[PDB]
Symmetry: D2
Subunit: 234 residues, 4 copies
């Protein structure tokens, strides 16, 4: 086997094991703040921040044919000055080692209009209905496209902390995404199969991406903690 793991209950500014892109920064308060915010703490429209764990992960082996199973968890929140006008969302994803930020707003920094997507697999938390979207805030599974292969309703709550759990079982190629609000005693879950061998390169970096509304502030997105474990078998 080949394994890797990590856990933090907080971020540390300038931590050398995280790559930051876009507007993403880490506050003295230990928060990974993905989007730029006004004085009064008001998200600025057209913000785009990404953050990637520095060490590349070995996700599958062309030689042995093995695919890793993995699991990630995190806590996050968003703040919306106007609960009625949200945009655009947050995503957890896997991409090529040299991944750079893509289009903002509704493309969540991952993808691009008029272009087939890099090899990017993501789990989205989407607040804004684009043409390709279902109605309402949803959770989705994106496989090389911002046009989700499967979705589900996300009972979101402004300013409350959401506890997220993502899991991938190589044995069934089944990806599971669950989200829970302890404050609310509320919960959501989504699942589908994903072939990692056909959607990602052998080695990838994993991380976060979030965007504020194109022309509106939408909501800011902050990640509070992060945990992650991968097991690639012999």
């Amino acid at each position: 086997a080949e394994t890797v793991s990590f856990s933090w209950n907080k971020f540390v500014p300038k931590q050398p094991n995280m790559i930051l892109q876009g507007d993403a920064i880490v506050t003295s308060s230990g928060k990974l703040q993905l989007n730029k915010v006004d004085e009064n703490g008001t998200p600025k429209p057209s913000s785009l921040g990404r953050a990637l764990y520095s060490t590349p992960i070995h996700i599958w082996d062309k030689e042995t044919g093995s695919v890793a199973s993995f699991a990630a968890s995190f806590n996050f929140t968003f703040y919306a000055p106007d609960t009625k006008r949200l945009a655009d969302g947050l995503a957890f994803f896997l991409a090529p080692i040299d991944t750079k930020p893509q289009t903002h707003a509704g493309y969540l920094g991952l993808f691009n209009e008029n272009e087939s997507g890099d090899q990017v697999v993501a789990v989205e938390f989407d607040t804004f209905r684009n043409s390709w979207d279902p109605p309402n805030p949803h959770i989705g599974i994106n496989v090389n496209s911002i046009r989700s292969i499967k979705t589900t309703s996300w009972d979101l709550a402004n300013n409350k902390v959401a506890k997220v759990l993502i899991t991938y079982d190589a044995s069934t190629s089944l990806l599971v995404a669950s989200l829970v609000y302890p404050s609310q005693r509320t919960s959501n879950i989504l699942s589908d199969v994903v072939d990692l061998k056909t959607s990602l390169p052998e080695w990838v970096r994993i991380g976060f991406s979030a965007a504020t509304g194109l022309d509106i502030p939408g909501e800011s997105h902050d990640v509070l903690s992060w945990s992650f474990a991968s097991n690639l078998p012999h």
Copy 2:
């Protein structure tokens, strides 16, 4: 801290670390078969089997005031000769060290008519609507009563294997129960708060209980694997 854990991908007949009650047995095939079955593999009505992990778990400390966080997973299935007439269900639970089987059928071997329940906490997978029940097969959280404190719809499927995950976070006293059918790419999740300090004794045994229909065969219930981890803090 104080921890304990275990994992098996199969059961072994006569394994000395499992307590069996009722009709529960372990097949040569490595299945923990909770209910008695006809020649043709047809569940017998009024069957009741329970099985408990032999070592008692330390769930909370009256001295320090600490409460354990824990997590359990398992795979299970049921077989119903007649999909239209199911009964009664299966449960995962925690009870006092000296726990014995209670009433069958709709009481899931856990509880009793006309009696306040021992200190029993359970997560149920309920196939039969009793008076106290909501309509349809559901998943529930029972806290000393068969009358669930909270429920959710269970998209079940005859003969398919369900992958279950139960979690308890002392920090928020939030219990989470999730169930997934990889065959179906289908999933369900439930959550609520439970005060272990007021609902269980310091030490408990954890295990399985299932019942077939009172006067009908309902469905049989088999557990295939079991994993479990507890962490009681200083």
Copy 3:
């Protein structure tokens, strides 16, 4: 695979997951005190206490032929009113589920004069030279006999805490025993091969045994903490 593990930084009187034999007790102070002691804290000669983890461990599989790898750690100490007259020692061991205390003093509660030993594997910390012994306090590897298959010098220290680590690698059948005194910055290590398949039953209980001098007080032995992990492969 099949795994089990546990960890405690202290013992709790009456803990239901420990079996006590002989004079062994657990103090309110969280110490597993193996031998009986005078008012003034003076060991009584001919004391014999054993303690076993309640759940039986699956050490090897006659069917699959697999053997578990495992690891145990603990902290312990002894007190000797007279450093010049020590006896007899302490042992960590594995034995049959129904193991009962054997001969005391130099037999460490494990074995018997004039009898071939049950299926008992042990790692000893031996303070008293019996006929079969090398000179000086030593650490040994006993395989069904109190006459160690291999030994090494133990730089012991009265009243100081020793940190012990025992490991078993099925892949090489190599058992490793290491002991460290942080106070002293001193350390000792021993290793040899042991065939578990030929020296123990499939299932065993693991635990501690200690004896005070036959006609002298020797030293008392206390275990402070215990950790343990086993992995039996498919």
Copy 4:
């Protein structure tokens, strides 16, 4: 807490999570070969290869004052065409993020003549007696100096695989280094206290360094596997 871990039973050429310096390469055979070798497999004198795990480790916190505990293991070997003329050795170490190779031969690529050492902590396996050295191959604990704070005899064996275990317990600041030859059923152990807070920077990279004899071939050094875990407390 803050943790990180990893395990590999083999290296993969071009793996993106390892930094290679000097002559270090990874063979198709999955071996991390630290030193350059003739056609016939004969070490070339004045070889110097280092290899570092790419992600920086958080070893202590100036803010909280906490220091990590950690553990590393590995398998390694050396080949000596002439068992009577060995040089110079291998080391496991921790250094600053931007660590570069230093002096070769007896300086093990870590240090320099006439210079006080960077903040480098190491555990050495030393085959050649330099002026500062004790007689015979030894294991040592180097703290900012190639002049070991403590040493012990190393019962080495040409061409056999050694299994190494290094541990650091913040609670006692005690570093433990153990080495075992299963082929030989032979073992060695060393321990001393090390103040990480005064000998390393908060963040470091960990890795391997080995050197062949100045003017002689000495022995080659190959690392076969690597495991590592760190836990930095709140």
